[PDB]
């Protein structure tokens, strides 16, 4: 008779069942900031971990359980087969190949698009009605890829899109107006990267359009060079990885924004990677980021923002430049 | 007049002043675990950072800039120059060699007492009423080396010590008993390090003590072999380092831990790393982990454990291998 | 074409279901608090309130969706007819005919039960699978009521019992030693209230048992008078009702408390009310507070605390009292 | 030697002085929701509880205080002497006359006014420095009857004023739009009364102008009557009242987060309680709601919103029947 026996008379027997399940793949610097910002902000019961590397994902999982204590997510579980992914909720990939100093997102197409053959397949296998949110780049296209390999409808194969730039976009917003980023609105929409389309004129604090107030907003006759702000925006990934070698934190935060809404049903708007053909006039397959209400669904909908002439050219361009990726990819 | 004028109508002048600001120095692995547990406990209005290295501390700083929208910490800054830790409540230093593959903490004594001579009188300067936290390792004696160069009053001067090898025995226990760590209670004191001890005496779920329930507990007689938790609690650090290269995480969320605590004026129990001459027939000032009340004062009272003559033993011993580089210590 | 159609694109049709809905019973002081930190704890996905005052319970409703943008639970729902509880995991019941300022928690007993029998059924018929937690007094005794009209196994039947006694005796503990609760430790169980027990030999801090420091603990001639600190266990509970009323905040907590182990699977321990047949002597069908391992499925185990004879004698006695009552009663 | 002794060894002495010290004055319905959404929201390391009924105060007190297990406040007291206020950082004036079935708030004004020349001269002896948050109806007046009798700058003194009323606003937009009110952006400002006016203009989702979608926004030809949205937000107090006999849960949730930006400060924008004179013609001491930045120091900006004709004047006919009542204002 253990100390155990002893000590806890049971009442039930091996009865489990995951509840709240999320799964990581990839445990490199996006994947364990997503896993510890998912873990400190209780959107889980059981956190599932994958990669190929089989010691530093021991060693990320053991890094994790033994902080247990100051936690509220009971089991955490890795492993290489994808059986400990079973019956999860949601399943965010974050393997892959990241970006060299200078290297554009979109190079990373072939040697990501390589491997979701294999990590897309398996998910689906054992969580065949999860939620998949892509993060590995070019988010957008590998969206696309993960909704034709997985089968899934679209409104479960969700990309992080531009809710790292929108939110990159209102922390420069707020740095210039002496405001918190969560009091100032604005909205970056389109490729996550280098095409992507800063929407001017919904630009706005407590609700009064700057654009509105400040004509030359958002142009190159603007005095005050506004559009110097969406530039950082671009620009800040590369400046970051140039700096440390790469980005994690902001992505992590972001990732698990996008999972809150998703494991709390909060219907809260957010600009993410999906499929947008039909409106401004696109006509293929498209991915990119437009506001869309995430919940315990997915994509549940999609806000049609109504855009300026200019606007929807800038849009409709960056639809271009990805459709012409998309329509040579091979899987 | 700018769109900023247009926009707000401002009524303040430039008081500023920090009111709960937390310092972190250096950005590595433990530094940036450290800074993102307590950005997301919301336990600071202003975070700064300092590194040597330039690059890595701007683009640690940027990146975490990047996620402000996501955080309650209005205020992210860095710098080589300890003037941006100025008026800090706490500062966590884990600047420092670590350790490689099977090397011991206390290998690193020298490499990182050189680098506190330069640190901690900096920090100081700029925080005289800080609380001090220390994670470099060997964290027990640089926190006695801390506290000599500071200058400052021992209940000031905290090594994260104990916290983070209870909260790793509480989670095997746990995972031996089915049981959370929040409700396992079990205590490991003395060196964060190989002759760390742990009491059996005092060990319980519920208040009924294991030891009592099972008098072979923590015995080489014991047919369950329990003290082998304590070796994995020993080799634990061994292993992830073994694994992943560092460990990061859960010494970050132990440090949080420690903070809140701290920060809240909590008057929770830690075990941490304080002076112990005086206790258990310790004539020297050695620095080691005992149950210490912590608040806004930092390390305010000591629980004065009752031991085992044989705990007793171990713990005296685990002092003396300390002090044995203690007096050899030259600064 | 309304200017819903025009803003927003829809992709799903009917959709939804509850995940992780919770469903209080009774909206008086108790119920309200109750919803107010299960709300404020981001628990439910979805918070169903019912009652049988229509007036009141449809204003305190509103109140709470009026704060809809300073929560993460997005449906908050009310009714008299059972069907707003369809397929919540769990449900609180609150509702009674609150037992009289003054008198115990008995001659009003088949009163309340009478509530029951019409609350369970309907419970059960729209959440066959959910857990039950009652708070109603005597909730000993109603808790067994509910297990017999529910039919629920078990495992799925808890009373608040103890859980709120012990917390009451961890703070009086705390203010005693300059200690936080959370870091006192000690245990009351057995009947809540006027026969509840405190288990002298679990109170310890941080491993050190107060008992065998200090072994006049508990007994009439302690010196220190330690007995003082659960017999205010008891009567602050007559102080508070006679000072304001009635209790609720803390109550409130309390169900929150057991409410995020329940909902979360955490698997602490805490002490609740349980069919505690087969234990410490107990013939009869009969529930009490011990501690117990709260989880997805209720009370999957259950800690056999060593009690000395005295204290095994009035579990005894309480639970004779309590069966006595049983067997009157008419449902 | 006493139990305590021979536990706790002592550091420490002299220690007092709260850092984050938050003071409730008035503990009915709204103070106590106030109290526990702080508590809750762990804003504070010191909560003082302040009232004129002594057995009221104390038992909400010890309410509160058996709760502290599941809280992160360590120190909650009371009292009828103000002494017990000392050195708080923001003190939330609740107390006072609500209002009966249809009353209007302004009829409160005269048993109010009184209650503040006894409650502020005492706040201010003891909370020189302190935040003054008004929430005693009628509050826009009282608030600035609190900034008379301290004789603060008006940074210092807030009313609780529109927050609530957006709050209220934002969550019928969104429940008519499907949409989380975290997404659904709204204003209403000026009284916090009948005479509250909607900015149309900056109603918006994903900053998509919804009165540009819409032109018939707001106006009686609008054909989806969304001007009764801003009409059942004039009246849903009125509808509470009639339903549960008060409001207490959703503005104790709206100066949490009030209390939140101020003791963090955030400098997120909130509609609340200023001084708006010289602003849209407004040449009296009027107080009313206008999107303020709030911060450590109280408000220190104003957001100049564009007010359309039309809500220009339904802001300053709001403004003049607001000072009418201050004109008449003897004290
Ligand atoms: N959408 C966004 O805003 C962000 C996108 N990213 C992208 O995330 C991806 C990963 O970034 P990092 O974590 O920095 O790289 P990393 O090199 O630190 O880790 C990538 C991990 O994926 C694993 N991996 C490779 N092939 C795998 C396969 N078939 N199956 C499972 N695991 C596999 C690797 O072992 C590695 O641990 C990159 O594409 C990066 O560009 C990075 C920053 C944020
Ligand atoms: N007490 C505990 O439980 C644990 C302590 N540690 C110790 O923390 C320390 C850091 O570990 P890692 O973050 O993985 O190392 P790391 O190599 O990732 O980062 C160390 C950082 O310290 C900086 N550094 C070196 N010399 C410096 C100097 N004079 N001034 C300012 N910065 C300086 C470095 O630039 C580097 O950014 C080590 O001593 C490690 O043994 C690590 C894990 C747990
Ligand atoms: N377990 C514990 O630690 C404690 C238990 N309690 C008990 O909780 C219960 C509620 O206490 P209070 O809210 O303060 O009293 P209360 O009388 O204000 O609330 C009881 C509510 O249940 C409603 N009710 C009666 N019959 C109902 C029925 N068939 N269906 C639905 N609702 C019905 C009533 O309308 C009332 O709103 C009482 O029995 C009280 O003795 C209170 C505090 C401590
Ligand atoms: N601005 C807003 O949105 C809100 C404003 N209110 C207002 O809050 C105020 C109170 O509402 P309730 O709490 O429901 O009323 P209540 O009657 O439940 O409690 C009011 C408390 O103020 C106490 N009081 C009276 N004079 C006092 C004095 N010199 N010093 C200290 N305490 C004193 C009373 O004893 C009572 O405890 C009213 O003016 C109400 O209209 C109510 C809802 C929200």
């Given at each position: 008779?253990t100390?155990?026996?002893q ?8 009865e489990?069942?995951?509840?709240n399940?999320?799964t990581?793949?990839?445990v ?7 896993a ?7 959107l889980a ?9 089989e010691?530093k ?7 994790l359980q033994?902080?247990?204590?100051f936690?509220?997510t009971?089991?955490?579980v890795?492993?290489?087969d994808?059986?400990?992914?079973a019956?999860?909720?949601?399943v965010?990939?974050?393997?892959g190949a ?6 554009s997102?979109?190079?990373?197409v072939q040697?990501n698009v390589?491997?979701?053959?294999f990590i897309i397949?398996?998910?689906v296998?054992?969580?065949?009605n999860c ?10 296209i590998?969206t696309?890829?993960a909704?034709?390999i ?14 790292l730039?929108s ?7 707020g740095?210039?107006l002496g405001?918190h980023?969560?009091?100032c609105?604005?909205?970056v929409?389109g ?10 004129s ?7 359009s700057?654009?509105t107030?400040h004509?030359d ?7 005050e060079?506004?559009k ?20 994690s ?7 698990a ?5 998703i494991?709390?049903?909060?219907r ?9 053909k039909?409106l ?22 999609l ?5 300026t002439s ?9 639809a ?10 091979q899987?």
């Amino acid at each position: 008779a253990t100390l155990k026996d002893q000590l806890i008379y049971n009442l039930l027997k091996e009865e489990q069942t995951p509840q709240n399940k999320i799964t990581v793949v990839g445990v490199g610097a996006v994947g364990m900031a997503c896993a510890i910002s998912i873990l400190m902000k209780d959107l889980a019961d059981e956190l599932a971990l994958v990669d190929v590397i089989e010691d530093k994902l021991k060693g990320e999982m053991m890094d994790l359980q033994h902080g247990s204590l100051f936690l509220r997510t009971p089991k955490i579980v890795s492993g290489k087969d994808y059986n400990v992914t079973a019956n999860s909720k949601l399943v965010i990939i974050t393997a892959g190949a990241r970006q060299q100093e200078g290297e554009s997102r979109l190079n990373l197409v072939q040697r990501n698009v390589n491997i979701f053959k294999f990590i897309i397949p398996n998910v689906v296998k054992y969580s065949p009605n999860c939620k998949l949110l892509i993060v590995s780049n070019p988010v957008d296209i590998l969206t696309y890829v993960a909704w034709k390999i997985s089968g899934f409808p679209k409104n479960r194969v969700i990309g992080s899109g531009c809710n790292l730039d929108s939110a990159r976009f209102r922390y420069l917003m707020g740095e210039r107006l002496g405001v918190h980023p969560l009091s100032c609105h604005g909205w970056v929409l389109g490729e996550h990267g280098d095409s992507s389309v800063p929407v001017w004129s919904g630009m706005n604090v407590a609700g009064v359009s700057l654009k509105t107030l400040h004509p030359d907003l958002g142009t190159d006759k603007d005095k005050e060079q506004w559009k110097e702000v969406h530039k950082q925006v671009v620009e800040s990934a590369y400046e970051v990885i140039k700096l440390k070698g790469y980005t994690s934190w902001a992505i992590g935060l972001s990732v698990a924004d996008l999972a809150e809404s998703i494991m709390k049903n909060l219907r809260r708007v957010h600009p993410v990677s999906t499929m947008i053909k039909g409106l401004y006039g696109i006509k293929d397959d498209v991915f990119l980021s437009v506001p869309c209400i995430l919940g315990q669904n997915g994509i549940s909908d999609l806000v049609k923002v109504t855009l300026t002439s200019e606007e929807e050219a800038r849009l409709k361009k960056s639809a271009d430049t990805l459709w012409g990726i998309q329509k040579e990819l091979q899987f």
